C-alpha cells in the first residue's frame, strides 16, 4: 500500500485533529473530495487503484463501473471494508470486496448496462489512510446502450452538475488506454464543467498506445493545450493486461521505462507518472491543510481572546478572602442602587 | 458554440432529402461514446440512409475487437456496419500508395 507521503502526513494532521476534538469544536480540514469522470471503459476505477497502488477496484473494457461510489476512508487499527447498506461484514481482501460490491451493483441496475443514482457507500478502515470521502463515477454514455432509456445521458451530465460540480471536488480527467486520445470524454467533461482548471487535474494515457508517427508532447507540456494544473501522464493497461492481472509494480517499472525510452517522453518521464502524480496530489493536500490554517488559527485566536477575559476576572483569586466577598457586596448594592435609580428616575 | 455551429452546419446538410450519412468511427474509440450516432438516430431512427464505419482495426487495444460489433449485433441497424481500416500517421509519412 503506502506511501510514505500519507505516512508522514497522518501523525501531524492526527495530533492537529485530537487537539481539535479535545478543544471540543468540530473543526477539520476540510480534505476534498476525489471524483474522477470519463466515459464507457475510461478506467477511472484503474487510474483510481493504481493510484492506490493495489488493485481493488471493478475494471475493463465496455462499461465496468455503472454506480456512484462514495469511499470514506476512515483511519482505525486494522483495515478492512464496510457498507451501509451491508451492514455487519469486514472483509480484509480488497479483490473480494471488490467481487462483492460489483456483485451489488449488477444486482442493483442489472447486467444490461444499468446505472444508479444512489452511490454505494464503503467505508475503509485503515492505519495508511486519512477521513476521506472518494466519489467513484460510472462510465458515461452518450447514446442509449443496454437497458439505458434515450435520456441517459443528460440525466448523467444533472447527475454531474448536482454533485460533482460543488467546492472543493477534485475532478480527474482521465483520458484512458482503451479509448481514443482525442476522444476523452472525461477531457471534454472536464473543460465544459470547469475552464478554469483550478480543482481539475488532467491524467493522460496511451502515449505508448498513439497512432504511430505522432506524439503529444506539445500536449503534455501545456503547450497545445493550456491548462493551469498542467497535465501527469501515466500508462493504463489494455484489456488484455487487466485480463492477465498484472502486478502493479512491474506496470509502474514498465511504463516509467517506456517513458524513459520514448524520445518524445523521455524529458517528461520525471514530469508524468503515477508515483509523481501521487506526489503532486499528496503536495497539493498538505499545501491545502497548512493554507486553510492560518484562517482557523486567527479565528480561534480571536475566540479564546473572549476566554482570556474571563480568567482576568478569575485572575483576582484568593480563597476565601473577604475582599472579594465585599467586593461582590459593594457591586450588587451599587448595582441594586442603580436599580433603584432606574426605578424612580 | 463550435460544436453547435458545427452542429448546425451538419444539419443544414443533413436535414435535406437523401443525404446518406457515414458515422465513422475508429476502432480504439468506443462507438457509444461518438454522438454521431446520436445525430443519425435524431435525424432517423430508422436508420435507413445511416451507414456505421468503425476504422483504424489495425490500431485496437490489446484484449478487444470489434467482431461483436461489426457483425449488426451490440448495436442494431438494419444494413449493418462495413469495416475498413484507415492510415496510420507513418502512412502518409512513408507515402503508401493505393495498391499497399
Redesign the interface.
Known amino acids: 500500500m503506502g506511501n510514505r507521503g500519507m505516512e508522514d502526513l497522518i501523525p501531524l494532521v492526527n495530533r492537529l485533529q485530537d487537539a481539535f476534538s479535545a478543544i471540543g469544536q468540530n473543526a477539520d480540514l476540510d480534505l476534498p473530495q476525489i471524483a474522477v469522470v470519463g ?3 475510461a478506467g477511472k476505477s484503474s487510474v483510481l487503484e493504481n493510484f492506490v497502488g493495489r488493485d481493488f477496484l471493478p475494471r475493463g ?2 462499461i465496468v463501473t455503472r454506480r456512484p461510489l462514495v469511499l470514506q476512508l476512515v483511519n482505525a487499527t486494522t483495515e478492512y471494508a464496510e457498507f451501509l447498506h451491508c451492514k455487519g461484514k469486514k472483509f480484509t481482501d480488497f479483490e473480494e470486496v471488490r467481487l462483492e460490491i460489483e456483485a451489488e451493483t449488477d444486482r442493483v441496475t442489472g447486467t444490461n448496462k444499468g446505472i444508479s443514482p444512489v452511490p454505494i457507500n464503503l467505508r475503509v478502515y485503515s492505519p495508511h489512510v486519512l477521513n476521506l470521502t472518494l466519489v467513484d463515477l460510472p462510465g ?4 442509449p ?1 443496454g437497458d439505458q432509456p434515450p435520456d441517459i445521458e443528460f440525466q448523467i451530465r444533472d447527475m454531474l452538475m448536482q454533485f460533482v460540480t460543488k467546492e472543493n471536488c477534485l475532478i480527474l480527467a482521465v483520458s484512458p ?4 486520445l482525442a ?1 476523452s ?1 472525461a477531457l471534454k467533461v472536464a473543460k465544459e464543467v470547469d475552464p478554469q482548471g483550478q480543482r481539475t487535474i488532467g491524467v493522460i494515457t496511451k502515449l505508448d ?1 498513439m ?4 506524439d503529444a508532447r506539445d500536449v503534455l507540456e501545456n503547450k497545445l493545450l493550456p491548462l493551469r494544473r498542467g497535465y501527469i501522464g501515466v500508462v493504463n493497461r ?6 492477465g492481472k498484472k502486478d502493479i509494480t512491474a506496470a509502474l517499472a514498465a511504463e516509467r521505462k517506456f517513458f524513459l525510452s520514448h524520445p518524445s517522453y523521455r524529458h517528461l518521464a520525471d514530469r508524468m507518472g503515477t508515483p509523481y502524480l501521487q506526489k503532486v496530489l499528496n503536495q497539493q493536500l498538505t499545501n491545502h491543510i497548512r493554507d486553510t490554517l492560518p484562517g482557523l488559527r486567527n479565528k480561534l485566536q480571536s475566540q479564546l481572546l473572549s476566554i482570556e477575559k474571563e480568567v482576568e476576572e478569575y485572575k483576582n483569586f484568593r480563597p476565601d478572602d473577604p475582599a472579594r466577598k465585599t467586593k461582590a457586596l459593594l457591586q450588587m448594592v451599587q448595582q441594586f442602587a442603580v436599580d433603584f435609580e432606574k426605578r424612580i428616575e
Open positions: 466515459g464507457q471503459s473494457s465496455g458515461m454514455t452518450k447514446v446502450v488506454a482503451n479509448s481514443d476522444n470524454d498506445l497512432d504511430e508517427g505522432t489494455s484489456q488484455k493486461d487487466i485480463d
